[PDB]
């Protein structure tokens, strides 16, 4: 769920949430997508870094976001 998963990855991608939303959009497509894929999207480097970081974390399940 892009909105909650993302506003869980943090308020750093406060625009990249929507930049993933308007376009194709998917939760597992995130896990399986990659570097230049997300860079074509103009998202800066630390945003990309935290994105793939938390994404690996969820693919393992250690993330499991919840609005707290």
């Amino acid at each position: 769920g892009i909105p909650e998963f993302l506003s869980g990855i943090g308020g750093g991608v406060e625009t990249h949430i929507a930049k993933l939303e308007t376009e194709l959009g998917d939760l597992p497509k995130l896990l399986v997508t990659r570097t230049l894929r997300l860079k074509k999207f103009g998202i800066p480097c630390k945003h990309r870094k935290l994105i793939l970081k938390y994404s690996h974390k969820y693919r393992l399940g250690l993330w499991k976001p919840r609005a707290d």
Binding site: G1, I2, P3, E4, F5, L27, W63, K64, P65, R66
Partner: peptide
């Protein structure tokens, strides 16, 4: 729980 969260937030 969070999986239904990331399945029902959209």
């Amino acid at each position: 729980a969070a999986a239904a969260a990331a399945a029902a937030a959209a």
